[model samples]
Target chain A: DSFIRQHLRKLAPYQPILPFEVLSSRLGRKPEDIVKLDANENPYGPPPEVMEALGSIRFPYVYPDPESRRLRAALAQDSGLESEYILVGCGADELIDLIMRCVLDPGDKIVDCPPTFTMYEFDAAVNGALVIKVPRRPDFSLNVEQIIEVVKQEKPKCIFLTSPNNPDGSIIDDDDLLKILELPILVVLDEAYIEFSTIESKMSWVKKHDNLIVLRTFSKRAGLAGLRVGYGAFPLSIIKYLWRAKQPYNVSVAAEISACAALQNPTYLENVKDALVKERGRLFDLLKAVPFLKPFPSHSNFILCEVTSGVDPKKLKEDLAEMGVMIRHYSNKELKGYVRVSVGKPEHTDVLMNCISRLS
Target chain B: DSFIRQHLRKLAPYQPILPFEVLSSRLGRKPEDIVKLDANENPYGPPPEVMEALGSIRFPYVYPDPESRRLRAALAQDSGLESEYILVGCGADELIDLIMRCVLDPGDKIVDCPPTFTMYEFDAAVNGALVIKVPRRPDFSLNVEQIIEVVKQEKPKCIFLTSPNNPDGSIIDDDDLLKILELPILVVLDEAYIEFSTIESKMSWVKKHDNLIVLRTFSKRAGLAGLRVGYGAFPLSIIKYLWRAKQPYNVSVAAEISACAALQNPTYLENVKDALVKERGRLFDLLKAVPFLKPFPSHSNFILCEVTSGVDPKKLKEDLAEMGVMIRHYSNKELKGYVRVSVGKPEHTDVLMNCISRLS
Candidate 1:
């Protein structure tokens, strides 16, 4: 019992989410028929090239390139950021945890803007660092003033910003981000869903901004989330240290080659993004018609909606799931009254709207 | 400039390895022509089912089951250990690092027995933990008395043991293992090479020994090294925290499916192991016949040889590589004059023996 560290021994229990197969079995519906709109995963998977590459791999016996050279090369071309400043990870999730391990010593502090991605806070706690919460404003916008005040007072080692942020799907204002970056904090700007946003990614900014890291993932852009590939752009000074600390085989052969194959077809990636953007509009309009719901405008792939007029958000999510429609509900204090749904295909939207209206 | 933690900023720079492609290009030879007797990779690769499974993954768009349910169930059936105590990781490498993150506080010490896998020390330094070395004996066996004395004096948080230890493939004896486990320190027994060693795995031991963790990998067993699948058996008390702290999708769909596919063909796995075991015997005999090298009897896939008659081990490896053969040489002081040759196909054995004899 005493074998574990005092901190980890007291870590909060892990919460479980339904993988598609488990949800299929529980609902008595096939995965394809489940009208799944949870988790913001792309409905359209990566291009055919990805499957061909996976099956036809010439050297599965060889260890993956620790550098993920081919994937990084393709990423460099697409990003216009050179390969030297880029590093691949298991997912952006790994980079988040890896950064903490390298930067946070025991009892040091990291500032987190929550109702954002929870992983930043999760990684900080795991690294034995204190988290200084700078909660987003009621509208889910960055509270630049509070962030400045906290940084001066707490001297947190870094700040995690997600744009468009998860759960709410709100992007940080460029000016607000610049304000935060001016402070003496290492800024990790997560753009896991940036491809869906109208604004361009700031990944290239790492070259100029010494303290900035911009994380991008194939999880959304290429629908390879299940394949687990994410990458980030870091300043050379910082990347050199990360390369040292990172696991040599952090990116698996399947991960690296799959990401590269996806990158090979820019047209496929763009077409899927267009379709999701097109469908997000239709889904948003339909949700507003439901008397009990108020949908937030989202730049990313998912919509966050308010459960209004005494409707229970948790019950709404469950009832939809039982009827073979899956949407996400949050138990965190801030989101308990809300539910988030990923933008699904046209028929999936029809099924969801039909289900919600029938409840009304 | 001041972003990194002080300890990490001072950490050693990474030493790069040649991926098969890079090495092939650099050598002006094809990857297939290079007999890669390095890294202990199973060149037999995973059974044909693995590639087919990867190509036809039903939901590459969806996030993987964070719980890794299907793969763990298969592993439970294969190992005869219950599924409740098993945790899967990206690789045994990640598990090695993850265990440290859970147990080692900054400045916490971990006992390392060298002339073994170097990852334990690499991860310790990354976690800001100090390493207390309990060097192995000349015969590549654990120095149990020194480990006991160090555990008593240093009061380390954990100890890492690689049975059928790397480079040199000797295993830790039962008495040595039992005596060390009696100490207060948490013991991690890495049995990555155990399947090849003609020894029963200690996976079932975790059910009995609250202080023990046993790690096994699909890397060597199923030839899914490139897919990065590794699992560990831990006391439930320790594993609860690990589950809470581990990345939700630490294991990928490709990894899970590939490992599961490999498990499906138990006959193929057994046959490959037998062939490698047979090849190891012949390889050992050939190396012994070389006048300038003395090869150690190995219980694992690789054999370590001491340079004799003033032959330089580094030169031996380099010469082999130039001849489209690759073996391992280490920069570590302890293994400076040693070469490790992994057992390969019979023709590969012929090629290597011929190369050495030609040099003589």
Candidate 2:
């Protein structure tokens, strides 16, 4: 205990999220029978090419390439960005933490817009950096004025902006992003759900803006979340240090191959994305029909709903879970009385709706 | 450039290691034909169960469990340790860096023994910690007296000791380990190659010592290096902080599943370890017979050789690479004239030996 760092000793205990199999056992249902809509996972897994490539993994015993050369090249071809600006990680989660490690000194501060991806704040706490929250507007758009004020007053080292933001599925427009990019603070644009949105990813913007870094993941777009592969585009000056600081064998060969195979069949990737987008619209309309739910418009794979009065959001989540339908519910101060449902296949949506109607 | 941390900006550029496919292309040989022994990879690959399990991954789209519960349970069964004491990582590589992050504040010091796994030093630099070198004895044994003296003088937060240490493959006896354990600093015991050694792993020792951490990996044991799974045994007091600070999904589904599947076929794992131990003897004998080499008897899977006056270690490594036989050579100050050869199949050993004699 005495050997642990002073800052880390105060860190909160990790809350465990149950795996699907455990959930299945608890619910007394087969894993395939359960409706898993909690984590915003793609119901349609990666392209068939991914399974083929993974099954034929030739060198499971070798260490991964520190420079994910082949994957970066594939990413370059896919994104139209040069390979030099790209760096792959275990997941975008690793990159989020890596950026904190490289940029933040102990006690440094960062600007985080709430009801966004929670990783930025989580990583800041782990890095011993302070988080200066600039809560999103009621409509879940970035409070750019508040962000600029925080950047100037708090003088945070970086500001994290999630496009098609988590929990609410709202986005930051170019004007808001560009304004933030011009500030002295570093700008990180997270495009984790960009494929579901009609807007273009800002990944290539890194080449033009020295302070800009854009992160994207195979988890959502390619449906390999369980495989854990993500990539980022950064200016040469900043990426060089990340290269030096990152774990050399961070990207597993399985992750690299799986991602490359997903890219190989762009048609499959596009088709999956299209199917999800269509389902998201359908699910949003269905969710609006629920008496106790006010569903938000989403340009992402999931729909977020504000639980109305007369129904406890916690109870709603529990009732769904009891019926072998899993959905995310929040207990935090910022997102209290809210629930997020991932858009699954048409059948999963039907099952979820049936379960919700049964409760009514 | 101003956005990056000062310590990271000064960190050395990462040296790239060629992947097998790139190496194959460079050598104009098929990947299967190349005798790859450079990284101490398990040439036998994994047991049949690993491939079957990987091909059958059902939830590649779902996020990995933050707590690698199943893998931890499997490891507990394998190591005879309680699941609570174990923490899984992307690789033992992630665990090494995580231990550093949890124990060392910026500018804190860590004791590193030279000619060992270079990661200890690299991670220290990355974490902005100062490295206090306690060079090992000429025979590659830990200098207990010097270690104690350094601990008294430098007060390093932790000391990294690899049993069956990396380059020379020497083991630290109980007497030496006990002496070091008595010191105030934390002790990190890396048992990356422990399975090949006749000696037992000190993993269970962590239960008795709050300041001790024992790390083990599936890379060598199960031929799952490319899949990136490693684990550690930590005392309850120290592990809580690590849990909070670690990236939640650091261990991917592929990693966890691969490791659990590898553990299932314990008979296959044992046979593979036995084959390597047997082949290490044969390889050592052959290297000793060569006129220009002085091979070290190793407890681990690889043998370290000291090049004689007539042969240049760099030239020897390159000459063999030309023949589609890859082996490791060091260029750093301490081990400049040394070469390490991983134990491969008998045919790989024959190919390496045949190439060496051609130069003679």
Candidate 3:
């Protein structure tokens, strides 16, 4: 008797993440006392200009520019890409879902790389498109041969690849990316954490590949995750339809202003990235000392560790939370017994190391 | 060779609307100098507390509470509904599209009453669903009988009803709404301007009717349109899917904080509503005096006027823009010869009347 779509009925139950305030209340500690490394959030936050710009926002009453002109102009200047090639979204999350809405019809299929960002698969399910998962190799590299085989057999509409991929933080090799780009399918390269990686971004490659889209977010780089601003570089042929289909005013005034202000201070962004990258090395070496943990080296701000010797990953996460240290734990069939810790400040790393030493 | 889905390829070309800043720059005037009556935006803006809250936001870097617990709790308190029944969106616009994404399969249909809000149709197109137009009556009242006929015959998945209907500012009576709600299809009642009208909101009806959803926004009531916050009340039977399907951080922290702060100052929201309601009266009277304008009675913030004596509506809007007094003009066939003027401050009304007199 239900009118709801059948595909959506089977969507995994939403797993809620507790925010800082709630977590602090639960742990009986002030928010500043908690060493939070979960969700890969930037601890340094945005530049001072972002707060000033937010406080001075003039038209809190008027609808935002559906086009997000000011921020796009800033992005154009920052990236050397024309504003016409860009479209902003609530986040890179929205663009991912919007691309699915624009490209996939009911029963359409998409090639997904597992142990990567989960949103692409989640969004596909919501859009009533089938997901053709091509699990990454044990070392967390894409199974390009399997992906090509799936594309040939199942004919997925697009392939989602995250460079400096989440969970493992490994970048896709340029040759593999170029090989995949040759296929007759749209390619979405999510560079959400690209600013932290040593490699250059693929934003300029959209000019050469009609099917390529490069998504970059202000979340990790500018510390505007709460503001929900993300932009993408799309080929001209695809950008037109996205412009027509996108919610006008998808990005809010605060989001655009905050992003613009953050962009104005690249020095602050660079300094924070440098600090995190440096901290990641120290944290990795420290993590390696823990006998029960097998830590993976990362180019991005986070490292994934394999919990070993009969230690429970969920219990480790819970015990850390109890000690006012929070890190990500996974229960997905592909990622069970694993924990991912974002590189925080030196002080945060000290707290996390102390907590892990106590667990031993 | 376009990568977009077929329906998106056929979507209407994007029509750019000049945002406030762009319009001000083009007119060679500061934004403060323009009497912007277009888009029905509240000129008084949000309360002072909103700015204060935005200024001191603790975590601009942290991702927003995916559940929007604080704001939804505030909404539950503001309305008599429980927090579970409310869902926050980037804007009501996002919910409109999200609803379509959940309910409609490709080529599935929805009943749209035109010359109402155009977004329902726009969202349907993006979801690859067909729109079955059930045009409003000549006086802008819902032709409930015709709507029922269309629903039964076309087998549309849902019907979108707006009150105080956009452009004309006509409200739907409860008796008419109740009759339509009894039908088999889902009924989405958008009350974006309900606070401006004298009638009570139909939000509580979601509890009584499993198929009903009521949408409201801070844009009109609390003047946070530029912040992009809107919420909907949904039945328990259907809201679960929306929760599972929507973007985790759909509501930004700035949006949530500003909206909750605006809610805290109920007196300010009330005062602004009273001022706009009062100005709407004077503006209506002034519009009647224009020789070539046939103004309609309006229950909302804006009034619809018919352009008579071969007065070009487009030129009238352009002329007003030149005078720095912006009003809405429609290009659709049904509204082609009309202009909609939002009720602004008394001085804005005087400026608008003077400009119209000059035109005459």
Candidate 4:
């Protein structure tokens, strides 16, 4: 008890999220029988080449390349961003925490746009930094004016902006990005879901903007979320410090080998992306038809809906799960009234829609 | 440049380790042809069952169970420690950093014994904590008298101890451990190579000792180093904070599944450890016979040797690598004149002996 940091001891007890196996067993259904629409995962996993690589890994006994050279080389070819700019991490999660560790000292502050991806606030707290909240607008777009005001007043070191933002699935416009880039604060533009969005990645933009770092992941695009690989492109100046600060074996061998194999089959990755994009459209249309749901337009793979008044979103999610359909419901007050449905296979979408109809 | 942490700006550049493939490519030799006695990796890889599980991951798209329920359950049966006390990490590396993050505030101090695993020092730097070096005695044994003195004088938050300590390979004994446990500071006993040692593991001791945390890895025993799965056993009082502070997806699904599959074949893992232990004895005899080397007695899978007379340890490493026989050499002030050789197959040991004889 004396060993733990004072702030960490005060942290709320961990909230459990039921994983697929646990949820399936509890519902008395096999994993295959369930239609899972939560967490925006790619139902269509990586190409068969990925499994082949994992099964035949020649050196699982050896330590991984600390620089992730082979995978970074593959990423360079795939993204047209030079290997110099890219650094791989364990699920983009490691990089999020690493950035704060390299940049934030105790008592330093970071500006976070809330009703977005929650990891930023969580990571900031873990790094002992104060998070000055600049809540997003009602439309789930960046409140750039308030963000600029907060950054100027609080002197926060950085701002975390997720493009093709989570929950509501909105992308930040170039004008807003350019305005933020002009600020003194370092801007981390997380593009975790950009493959499903219309725009090409901004990873290459790091060369042009000294303050910008664009992060993207294999989790969504190649359906390798379980494999835990994500990467970021940083400016030449900041990338050096991140390299020096990162754990020596931060990226695992399976991650690098599997990611390289996935990239090798570009056609397979493209097909999976196309399928999810098309499904997002159909899923949006279907959700809009549900009388008690108001689905928002999404550029990413999930649709966010405000449960119509008098309907309990939490119960709506529970009811769907009971019917062997899984979706995400937020617990934060800002998103408590909303439920998110991920873009899955057409059959999964159909099963979800059918289950929602009974709830009405 | 401006946003980087003040302490990190002064941090040293990343030191890279050459992976097997990279070494093979550079040496113009096939990986199977090279005699890799470096990094202390278990040459006998995970059981065949591990490959089967990895090849057919049922849900690569779904996020991993943050709690790692299945693997922890298997570990409980394996180690007699309850699942409640076990926490799996990306590697033992993540847990090392996590412990520091939960324990250290800025400027907090940790007692580190030099000529040990270098990560303890590296993690302390990353966390912005000061290192109080309680260097090991010339025989590579813990200086318990000095450690107790520093703990009282400096009031460091914790101390990191490695049994079968790296580089010099001397293990901490029960009497010394009991003395340190009585101190007021937290103790992290990293037992990464304990499988090859003759002593029973200290994992179950967490239940008896609140200040102690025992770390064990699948890397050395099951040969899953590249997969990056390691676990720690902590007292309930301390583990709760670690759970709250850890990344939600710290352990990947591949890591968990692979580790579980490895655990399924206890016979295979035990055989591998036994073989390594046997090989270590034979290797030690061969190294001791070398006229220019004085090998230390080791209770683990590797033997440490102090270069005798005029032989340059650094040059010795380079020459061995050029001949495709790789071993570890130290560059730190405390271990600068020594080389550590890992136990390998009989043929690997033979090749290494032949190479050393030629140098003579």
Maximum-lDDT candidate: 2
Q: Say which prediction, candidate 1 or candidate 3, comes out ahead on DockQ.
A: 3
Instruction: Give candidate 2's error at residue A253 in angstroms.
Output: 0.9
Deviation in Å, model 1, residue B177 alpha carbon: 1.2
For all predicted structures, in order, the TM-scores are 0.98, 0.98, 0.98, 0.98
Error of 2 at A22 (Å): 1.7
Docking level of model 2 = medium
Which tens-of-lDDT digit does each residue in B61-159 have in candidate 3? 888899888899999999999999999988898788788888988888999888877777778877778888888888888888998888888888898
Question: Per-residue lDDT tens digits of candidate 3, residues A227-300?
Answer: 99999999998988788888887789999889989988989999999999999999999998888899987889
Clashing pairs in 2: none
- Using Cα atoms, each model's DockQ against the true complex is 0.73, 0.75, 0.74, 0.73
The docking quality of candidate 4, as DockQ, is 0.73
Worst 10 residues of 4 chain B by lDDT: B10-19
Q: Report the poorest 10 consecutive residues by lDDT, candidate 3 chain A.
A: A13-22
Question: TM-score for chain A of every candidate model?
Answer: 0.97, 0.98, 0.98, 0.97
Q: What do the candidate models score in CA lDDT, each in turn?
A: 0.87, 0.89, 0.88, 0.88
Best by DockQ: 2
